[PDB]
């Protein structure tokens, strides 16, 4: 709605990923994504 | 999120976002994939 | 709209004329082109089958492009195109031969005398099927046909094996999605 | 080694406030300052240029210079309830944490306070506010290594409390988003030394 | 934007005429200008001081102009200009002596020779202090110096008294609000 | 620099003339020739194999020269030639199959389906392996790689022999030395 | 935020020989090598480019850069002494710690060594020498975060040994200035991954 309402930030990060693993399927890591590891400051991004 | 969604109980406390694909300038190589198994579809049988 | 870029149509063939001289934009080429869709199959001796038992089957299961793509749309027209390679190791005399059946006829319900071909294990068979039809074009698998289109009907003298593959003359393709994809059988 | 350097905008704080949150991001710009223990109660301050150069992250490809010569660029934006009601002013003053106290932005009236430039912020209105704060330094250039001199100090004030319904819901708040950077840099001269 | 008004730029100019001949508009001329300082300050005899342990109190009075206005601003440059009016009662021979003192040295850690003046009550001192200084103009009461620019160092013959005024030379101030300020002593 | 001779460009190609029609200058029409590389190599039944297994242990004798001077050089690129001449003594059917398969990726960990050829002992195979690739070129014997580029699976149905041999197609290398050399092996 | 970067040259390793000196250094390029385990005993080997840019300084003010393209430049000087005897050959290798170890510059003749690319040293007469080492990677261009492919080594050799008078003095010594910089760079991606 138009209540909804915020900021987001979209931001590349070209190369390999912080990821988890299983035996049968990968993930990813949320941990190493928090703003004091990637900031995504300077990178490429887009803020909506 | 760079700043949190701001919703009013006057509407749902939550949004959602949708990724659309496609691509341009697109280009391929060689037509032999790189799985170990062929290519087959999973087609649904009747049940579980 | 509103559309970005963080910041090409030459490196994409430039990097190829390097890299691959193969500068593939149309797939209609690639329907041309041929790929196997079983691996040894075989045949009942000194007699014929309607070829359909066998493609419906591979149909299904996407092995090749002619099927893969299938699963993309909905229409096409044109003359498909087959291939037998003989691999059976022991016939005293071998002839081989092909003839037109619409689609979904069965082998009884059908003559076995008209435009046909013969070869002798020369091992190989290299027929293209032309297209006719009677509405405009073809449902790529609707399952409610009195064969409408042609197709093939196959005899060999005696029980036979064979390789096969398959693509198309016009052949050509209506746009659709696509489902979803089977991967690796890890059972436990 | 290099033709031409940063000048990308980066963030700096991002702060919220909901209606009834006594604090000092509210008892908003008291009429008059008697005493230096009641001070003109503000809600941010910004040591400038240093806490730009350290946190915005291009110390590391800016650094191993000495001196230098620039104009702040910064920007504020807000996505905020409407349910809000009230205004905020934002302004600068060099050198406040040394001159004579009486002149400094605090231990002053609201009306002299306003008086410093700057822009104002409508909580509802002021979608994207500008704001551009050139050398203010008295010094030609200044100092990396030693990053001690920040020759301005910024504040954001309050000028009406965070007016909105009686009891205020969670989205009921206000955010902030923060952005500095700069332009008419000039750089010059290598140096070992570097800031810790 | 949205402006009204209720209906000038020489009737004020008029009035002026035949009211007051001064048209000010600019008030840099009102910092050419002096305006007393102190009333009856007092000095050590024979001796001398920086005049800043006056200067400093008196600026943070307001009671004149190039402290008034000192107050509504952040930045300036120029030379001061200042006056000492002798007034006192009883002397036998009167040098009255005046050197220059980075701003905030004291008298002990500088030396007393140099450019100077020197007059004898002729009852007056009247000099010009340049703009000398190291960065490219002044915080006007930046308390952390040691020295940047240049100012004044008195000495007299005698325990003294003086009269005090001030001014700028081409002096000149950054732009600010204003404080708070001061009215009566109504105490009971 | 200081040179000198004791006293050509001709009666090297006029000697060549009459002695010698073959007026080679460039190695690169080397490189398109073709040279044995095993004699008689065997291979498992009615299955398939990565030809690497072979071809890695050749490259390191320098038997021929598309190893012999890859020990000369770093980097390389275009399309590899193979052929396949069948000696095996004993058959009844014999298909003999190729296909595509990333440079050092395993044969289990691959598809068997895709761009292939076959033949029937016709008793050879002469295939052109293309130059597909994710840098720009290859160096030479890069002990690491997931298969960066393309290389040949083969598949026979039979307990089989062959004569192998191959070249390139453009296929061509960066300069460098050259190693120490083995002579014969006088055991005593 | 800057046009232009740094090709600044920076040092890397000062060496110092003396006759009679049987070591590593010495021992100058036997003529075959049959063994792997009497491979050609070299004098120093430098791993680039990664080397250059993490020991040059210029890594804070490039890094936040993922991809690059470069043609590295290097340059060695002496000042040594006269009584001195002998000559140096200086190479580059492309992945030789990886490659089939038959086609390493180790492990070959001094005749294949030389071979390769680049340029003498005469311990008295080539005063200052020059050599430029191109994009010799496969790979389009170099990673940073990573900086885990050094895309070739570089190796002195000696080809004869430091020869001199019978028994030597201090000053009868050699000694060497290396450096390293860069031209023919081309940096694009910014990235928040750093090279540790």
Request: hydrophobic share 35%.
């Amino acid at each position: 709605t138009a209540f909804h309402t915020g900021r987001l930030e979209i931001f590349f990060e070209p190369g390999s990923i912080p990821t988890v693993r299983t035996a049968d399927n990968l993930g990813p890591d949320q941990t190493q994504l928090n703003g004091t590891i990637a900031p995504s400051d300077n990178n490429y991004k887009y803020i909506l | 999120p760079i700043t949190k969604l701001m919703a009013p109980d006057t509407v749902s406390q939550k949004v959602s976002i949708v990724v659309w694909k496609w691509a341009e300038d697109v280009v391929v190589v060689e037509p032999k994939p790189l799985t170990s198994g062929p290519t087959q579809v999973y087609n649904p049988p009747a049940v579980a | 709209e509103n559309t970005i870029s963080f910041f090409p149509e030459r490196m994409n063939n430039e990097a190829l004329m390097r890299g691959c001289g193969e500068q593939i934009v149309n797939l209609r080429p690639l329907l041309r082109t041929f790929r196997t869709i079983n691996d040894n199959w075989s045949l009942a001796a000194n007699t014929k089958t309607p070829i359909t038992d066998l493609t419906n089957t591979a149909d299904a299961e996407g092995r090749d492009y002619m099927s893969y793509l299938s699963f993309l749309y909905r229409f096409y027209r044109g003359g498909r195109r087959y291939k037998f390679f003989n691999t059976t190791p022991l016939k005293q005399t071998c002839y081989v031969r092909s003839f037109l059946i619409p689609r979904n006829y069965t082998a009884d319900e059908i003559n076995t005398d008209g435009p046909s071909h013969i070869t002798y294990p020369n091992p190989v068979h290299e027929v293209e099927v032309p297209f006719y039809s009677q509405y405009r074009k073809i449902p790529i698998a609707s399952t409610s046909d009195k064969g409408y289109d042609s197709s093939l009907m196959y005899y060999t003298n005696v029980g036979t094996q064979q390789i096969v593959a398959r693509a198309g003359n016009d052949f050509t393709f209506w746009m659709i999605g696509t489902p979803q994809l089977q991967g690796i059988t890890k059972e436990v | 080694s290099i033709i031409q350097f940063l000048q990308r905008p980066v963030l700096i704080d991002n702060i919220e406030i909901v209606a009834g949150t006594t604090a000092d991001n509210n008892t908003a710009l008291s009429r008059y300052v008697l005493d230096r223990t009641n001070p003109q109660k503000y809600i941010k301050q910004w040591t400038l240029p240093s806490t730009v150069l350290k946190a915005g992250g291009k110390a590391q490809k800016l650094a191993n210079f000495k001196y230098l010569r620039c104009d702040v660029q910064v920007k504020i934006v807000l996505n905020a309830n409407p349910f809000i009601a009230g205004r905020l002013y934002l302004a600068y003053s060099p050198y406040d944490d040394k001159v004579a106290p009486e002149r400094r932005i605090i231990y002053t009236s609201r009306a002299g306070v306003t008086g410093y430039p700057g822009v104002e912020l409508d909580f509802q209105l002021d979608n994207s506010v500008e704001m551009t704060i050139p050398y203010a330094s008295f010094q030609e250039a200044y100092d990396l290594v030693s990053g001690n001199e920040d020759f301005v100090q910024l504040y954001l004030f309050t000028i009406a409390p965070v007016l909105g319904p009686s009891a205020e819901s969670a989205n009921s708040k206000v955010d902030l988003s923060v952005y500095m950077w700069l332009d008419n840099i000039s750089l010059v001269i290598p140096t070992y030394r570097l800031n810790p």
